[PDB]
Amino acid sequence: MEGVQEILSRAGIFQGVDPTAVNNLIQDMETVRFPRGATIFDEGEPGDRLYIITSGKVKLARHAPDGRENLLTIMGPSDMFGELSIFDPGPRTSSAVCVTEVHAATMNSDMLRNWVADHPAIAEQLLRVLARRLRRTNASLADLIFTDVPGRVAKTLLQLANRFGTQEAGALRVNHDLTQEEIAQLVGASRETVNKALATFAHRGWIRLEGKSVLIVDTEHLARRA
Amino acid sequence: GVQEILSRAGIFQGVDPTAVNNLIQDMETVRFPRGATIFDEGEPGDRLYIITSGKVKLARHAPDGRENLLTIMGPSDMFGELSIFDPGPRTSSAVCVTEVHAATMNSDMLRNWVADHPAIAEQLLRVLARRLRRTNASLADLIFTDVPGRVAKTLLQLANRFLTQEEIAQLVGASRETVNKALATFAHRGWIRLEGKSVLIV
């Protein structure tokens, strides 16, 4: 249906790819839905399925023997996950759990081989997608090593707003729905450290802290801090 | 053998060996003096380098203008590799520790290289994924593993072949007040040895 296939076409994997080929793969894709709280996969599990959300929220968490788990990200419409599986079938690098009911469409490595075979020119476009992904994954590594807590709070707030923000009267209302601990986990620091940084941010007039939402009043200043 | 050194490149792991050689013969060789910057953070980038001899440090600009060292690389290492699939501004500086010799290609060569060997396209998507696989593996550990464990990781990774005091602790991620006390404990167990910018591993 138009809107659902509109949502799908927006995914990273299709960004800057041949529009006709994108249409082609979209109609070959299988739909799935999952209920609220459903587990899609567990970290460690073998996989060969890439998911593109068309509706609802999935969280990806990282785990450990000691130092249990850590929210990695939260994802919504047009986002994809599990993409590694279809390029390098192997074990899942995270967990994926449904925060709400979720509707998605999926593919596996075969559908991908067939796809490229049909539209060879897209291999170059998909390498660009795979590299853009890399650019981002190394960045989060660098930030975690070198940026300070306030800085990474600033980053995390901006990243959530890019993905889940509402333009509101010159500001951006971010409706993440996360505990203080989860924000800490995204930032990679302690509930306490992260909460101070937030408070200093409010005190500066850059943000207003309201329930489980953040109103970013001063993007420029907050960004410069990031 | 420059070819062999070049053949040990991550970009080439598990790709058609004839497709690999065809490109090697056709890559440009380049040389830089000691100290020279190859590229600066934020300049338009479009070139992959593979080191054939010498050492290159990669770093990002820090606040207060300070220095943030991301990695040291020697023969067979490649930097700028992402600019070749996804042009645009460089995300680090690459600076020559010694005199440097290296081979290069641009995205313009890479387009022609796939169009000549469509077999590779999939092998190249696998490479990137494997690298992607590796970086998260690094991220998990970083949020989880102890600085000693991460100083042990940096030590083992650089030891492939056998940086100041405030440069190793950048690689590792935490304080030099932590990285050093991690390093001393290792030496007390008799694992490694001081000597200056030099370390001996057992």
Numbering used by the authors:
A (entry chain A): 1 to 226
B (entry chain B): 3 to 164, 178 to 217
Relevant lines from the article:
In order to shed further light on the activation mechanism and the structural and dynamic basis of allosteric regulation in the CRP/FNR family we determined the crystal structures of apo Cg-GlxR at a resolution of 2.5 Å. The loop region of residues 165–177 that forms part of an anti-parallel β-sheet shows no density and was consequently not included. In addition, the model contains two phosphate ions with an occupancy of 0.5 in the cAMP binding site, two glycerol molecules at the protein surface and 72 water molecules. The two independent protein chains in the apo Cg-GlxR structure adopt a similar conformation with an rmsd of 1.36 Å for 200 equivalent Cα-atoms (all least-squares superpositions were calculated using the RAPIDO server). It is noteworthy that the DNA binding domains show a higher degree of flexibility as indicated by higher B-factors and a partial disorder of two external β-strands. All Cg-GlxR structures form symmetric homo-dimers. While apo Cg-GlxR is clearly more flexible compared to cAMP-bound form as indicated by partially disordered loops in one of the two independent DNA-binding domains the structural change caused by cAMP binding depicted in Figure 2 is smaller than observed for other members of the CRP/FNR family. This motion is more than enough to render the apo Cg-GlxR less suited for DNA-binding.
GlxR from C. glutamicum (Cg-GlxR) has been identified as one of the central regulators of the Corynebacterium metabolism and more than 200 genes under GlxR control have so far been identified. Cg-GlxR, which shares a sequence identity of approximately 29% with CRP from E. coli (Ec-CRP), is a protein of 227 amino acids (compared to 210 for Ec-CRP) comprising an N-terminal dimerisation and ligand binding domain, and a C-terminal DNA-binding domain. The protein forms a homodimer with two structurally identical binding sites for cAMP. Once activated by cAMP, the regulator interacts with its target pseudo-palindromic DNA sites with the consensus sequence 5-TGTGANNTANNTCACA-3′ located in the regulatory region of Cg-GlxR controlled genes.
